[PDB]
């Protein structure tokens, strides 16, 4: 009593539909976050941060000059061939 003034078709259609949505997002958003469905720019998951924290761009090791590692103790060649030194046509700095 005294709420009937509010109760109305438009006030009801936006109350059932809108409320149904309020629960659809409140219950689905955590699942999307867990399954990496949310956009990365909007938010990064903890799993995303854990993997990204392991990435760096300063490793300059492991350069080899052969297609195969044929075992042994010597390993693949690691020294640039003499005939290849100074064979690059690099534009002047």
């Amino acid at each position: 009593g005294s709420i009937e003034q509010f109760i109305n078709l438009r006030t009801a259609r936006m109350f059932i539909y809108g409320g149904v949505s309020a629960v659809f997002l409140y219950k689905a958003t955590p699942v999307m976050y867990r399954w990496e469905m949310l956009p990365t720019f909007l938010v990064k998951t903890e799993a995303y941060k854990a993997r990204e924290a392991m990435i760096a761009f300063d490793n300059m090791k492991g350069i080899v000059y052969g297609p195969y590692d044929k075992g042994g103790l010597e390993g693949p060649p690691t020294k640039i061939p003499e005939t290849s030194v100074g064979m690059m046509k690099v534009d002047p700095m």
Binding site: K49, E52, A53, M54, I55, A56, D69, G71, G72, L73, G75
Partner: protein
């Protein structure tokens, strides 16, 4: 306008054949009692035990498998001379601090 094949021949014989293949395979598995549970892992028991020790913290992280065997080949002896797990862990720790 006269038809030679089934009106929906392409979908019929494509999806239909796939269905018969799948159903026949299930029947074959039942008759031979084949285990149907998919395992994506290797079954080397000693190895899986070493992996649990790493997950439990008994073996330090990023320790190579050749650092744990009782026989090493020549190439793994070469690697052991340059292996420093402690340094590797410190480097990873530094990266995490920088990221956060």
């Amino acid at each position: 306008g006269r038809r030679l094949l089934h009106g929906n021949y392409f979908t019929r014989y494509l999806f239909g054949s796939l269905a018969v293949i799948w159903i026949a395979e299930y029947a074959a598995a039942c008759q031979y009692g084949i285990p149907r549970h998919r395992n994506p892992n290797w079954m080397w028991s000693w190895w899986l035990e070493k992996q649990n020790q790493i997950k439990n913290g008994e073996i330090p992280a990023n320790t190579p498998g050749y650092a744990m065997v009782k026989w090493n080949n020549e190439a793994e002896q070469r690697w052991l001379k340059t292996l420093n797990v402690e340094a590797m862990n410190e480097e990873f720790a530094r990266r995490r601090e920088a990221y956060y």
